[model samples]
Target: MTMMDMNFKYCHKIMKKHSKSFSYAFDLLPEDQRKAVWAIYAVCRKIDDSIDVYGDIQFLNQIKEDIQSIEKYPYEYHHFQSDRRIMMALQHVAQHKNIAFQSFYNLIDTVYKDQHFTMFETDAELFGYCYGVAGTVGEVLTPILSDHETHQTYDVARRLGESLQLINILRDVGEDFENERIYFSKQRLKQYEVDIAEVYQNGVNNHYIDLWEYYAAIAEKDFRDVMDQIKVFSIEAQPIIELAARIYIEILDEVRQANYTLHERVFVEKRKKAKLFHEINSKY
Candidate 1:
């Protein structure tokens, strides 16, 4: 296979391994866009893995330099001598699709910030963090999906990204707590009278349930707004976006049904995800 083809295959494997929910929706994109998105996913996954798994600040610093290099010389950069597969693919996509390299820089900065802070003080700060890590993905991908870039489309895409990240925060509460990281707003925790101790407790409680329901409602509203503006995206992109949103919303539903006890993680079955994707694809 050509180097490009090989790199894409590598990215595809990473996507499938790290993000089954996202990969299911990603598979529905047109061929070129699908590969581009996979490249983006691989880069983001590498960033997360570097911090969360290895705690490698050196890798993050290298990524920052690589992003700057891509910005300066998108097509001509000879960087990525270390692990060129994912970075090469990312550079190729960013150059070919005219994706803003700064988005990746913003993502890297967010991940770097994650290394220091575990709790957020307010909703604004939380949303800013979400935008940096997740909404930037939307900004990077919107141009690939639409022929014309408009402010409204980017705004909607940002909202979609934030909504997905919010779902992640809710679903991974226990996991985050184990890592001593809490993405939920401290104000909200105070408002609900729920403590970190309660969160780590063995069983679900009324306070924790109320806190989860409030955040779930926020995610639900964000998803609703994205749905209302779904027509703004290209017809070809709509089905996958719908499918992804539905699957994530279903995750929130599962959390609710379990009464917000997230000691055991929640996920939708693969067969159910396929069915949901097929049903949405038929409609769009």
Candidate 2:
């Protein structure tokens, strides 16, 4: 196989193991686009793992440097040889798809913010974080999904990314708390009488449930907004993105059905996701 093929194979494995939600959506892309998407996701996963798994701030800095170097020396292909295969794969995709390097920089910035700021004080602050980390993914992938770029496409992509990331924040409440992190607004928590300490001690109660449901409704609205513009993408890309949104939103339903219980992470079953995909396919 060619080096690009091998690199994509490696990325595909990472996506399947570490980002099944994205992997499911990625399967809907045409072959070349799928490889490019996998490359983008795998590179993002590397940065995320450095912080979330290894707790390596220095490594995160190195990623920033590496991305800068890649941009500085874009044409010198040999500069990315060695242990930087993921960067090479990223370069391949960015060069081919006209994806801006700034999106990757924004993702690194999000990680840096996560390391320093554990709490948000306002909806604007939370949404800003969401846009950096997740909305940029939508921006990065937009060009690959369609040749036409309109204001609506950008809006839909941003909303889709935000919706998915909000679901992640909601579902990972317990996990983030254990790591001494919280994404919800501090003022809102106070408003709902949902103390972070109480959450660690008592788990989800009425206050916590109320707070979660409020955010869940916001996320649901974003999902519906994205669905309304789903046709902006190519016909081939539409179903998978819809399926991805549906699957993540279903996790919100799971949380509600369980009475806002979130001590354990909630996920949609694989069989259910498959059924949903089939249904989406029939309609779209």
Best by TM-score: 1
Give the Cα error of residue 20 in candidate 2, in Å: 1.7
RMSD of each predicted structure: 1.6, 2.0
Task: Compose the digit string of candidate 1's lDDT tens values, residues 26-118.
Answer: 888999989988988888888777754455688777777776777788879575733589888888887777776778888888888776786
Per-model TM-score versus the true fold:
0.95, 0.92
Q: List the residue pairs that clash in candidate 2.
A: none
At residue 165, give the lDDT of candidate 1.
94
Where model 2 places Cα greater than 4 Å from the true spot, the runs are 52-55, 81-83
Worst 10 residues of 1 by lDDT: 47-56
Model 2 CA lDDT for position 191: 92
Error of 2 at 212 (Å): 0.6
Where is model 1 more than 4 Å wrong at Cα?
Answer: 52-54
